[PDB]
Design a protein around this ligand. Sequence first.
Ligand code: NAG
Length: 634
Amino acid sequence: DTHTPEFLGDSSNSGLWPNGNYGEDIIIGVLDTGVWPEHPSFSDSDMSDIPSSWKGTCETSDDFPASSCNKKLIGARAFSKGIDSPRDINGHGTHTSTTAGGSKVQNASFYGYAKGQARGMATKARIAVYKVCWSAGCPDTDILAAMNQAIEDGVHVISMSVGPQGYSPDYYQEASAIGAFNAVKYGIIVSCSAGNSGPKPLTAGNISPWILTVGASTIDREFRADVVLGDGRTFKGSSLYTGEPLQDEFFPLVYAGYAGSSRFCTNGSLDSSKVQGKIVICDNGIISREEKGNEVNRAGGAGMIDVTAEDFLRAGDAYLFPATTVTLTDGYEIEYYSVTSQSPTAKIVFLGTVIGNSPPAPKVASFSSRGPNLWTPQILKPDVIAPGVAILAGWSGAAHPTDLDNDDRIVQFWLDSGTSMACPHVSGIVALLRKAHPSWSAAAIKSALMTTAYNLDNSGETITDVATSNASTPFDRGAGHVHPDSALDPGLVYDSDTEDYVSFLCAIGYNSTLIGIFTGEVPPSDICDNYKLGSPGNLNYPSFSVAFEGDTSNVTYKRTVTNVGSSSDVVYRVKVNAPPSVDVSVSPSSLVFSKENPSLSYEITFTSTLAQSFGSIEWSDGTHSVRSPIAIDW
Ligand SMILES: *[C@@H]1O[C@H](CO)[C@@H](O)[C@H](O)[C@H]1NC(C)=O
């Protein structure tokens, strides 16, 4: 996107973009709807030859020519054995691959909206496309085939904006869990969407401890079309209206519930004699916001105010006729004015793309799937948040912004929302860290993003939830919002390997048969005799999650921190922000690293003095802060 790198603090002056070489020579595998190869984001201008280490290929066709793949887009495979080409007829695959690794495109916009240079977070990375998503859906057998193939091909990062529609299956049933487990031993980082079933709890998916589970948040950008009434009251509105601008004049205002047989502005509901030259107020439901604009237009209306069912706005309404979207409560004020005033009038003031500190940002997206982790309460999910609301990236040439009959618009760049949009921002940042830190484990790269993630919005208050207008919790934002320039130099990391993951599979009570799904062998029945993790919460993880069985319960977890800073002789001190109704003790409270001792362990005890409660711990030396959120359930 044209603004997210700037919101993330990426720049060519310093930090992760230069030290990671914009991801030069890192390969990102994208498991999604495929790709639209005829697109300027796949330009390979000023890029070196594909390294011979790369064992990937391009499955060619009339529909997908050999000339599709170049030095930038270096891979394209399709996986339909679960029930045709890697070509992207949806748009979603082009949007995500392009967010993670798109070459720089000048003057990118959606009809002037979000205008700037569109850049992947890893602008110089190679992209390998693994099409696993068809109209029927994304079959488990094809997800697992593509992950195992991306590993064989030699990608560095798997970006997977695919997951369960609602509540998640258990690990052994999830392709993502099995695939990502295999990717670990090769240092391959797996970045996944948390899902779009928020704000209700327990909805997070792709929740394996060895996956970087990403939630969605807002940036400091709105797409603004305000309503002014004739009595001088003003209301915020949202629009991606793409047509000729409306006259800067007041129009007579009428509600569809008065002017027609339907407050929903269904086909043929408006009486033309009541809506000629009028702005018509339509209530949300039955049909899309844009389809309501077709009815207002058919009946001779000048414009449309759509009233949403929610008390917040999310940009995404590519109106073909002049219109703006307002909240439930603002809508009713405008409706009540339209019905009770002698001569009600309104103007829609189209302000376009607006960037500023009101409302504050980031906020956790209402739709972002939420913890707790449904299967393992002792693992906090999701892990981080990243931009996922109204993100400009690449789109399919075979897809209109809407499914309206009269929508013929073909765009290079579309604004889209989801944990789908958040995940590839993280996959791109992870590519950058891989280049800056070639020796780090997958776990160490993730740890670095989590222990530097920020938790205050640009107003200085705890990041809020769009759904509540109140402070969010770690079940909403994980360890916080990615801070790429800080993640380059985290000081300490919480490292983990495949053997730690087997100990976790043993701790959650999987028998040898289920462990064998992950390890790819028939282990002996007594395999878990050889693993002694205890609680799943003892897995070396950059966050803490406690599930108290009783009111006076106490829980102790073990962690190990590894110094990855440039100085071997460094001293860290712990600071504790204890959750309400929990006493927290850390032993030891000081860690003295040296060449002899580059890794040190500590124990943290949580004692209930009591529902859910939150806090944090941090380890600091002279220049580093290693922060971990704490979540408590009773
Ligand atoms: C192992 O666990 C699975 C899933 O719970 C179960 O269906 C299977 O019968 C188990 N195998 C043995 C030998 O207990």
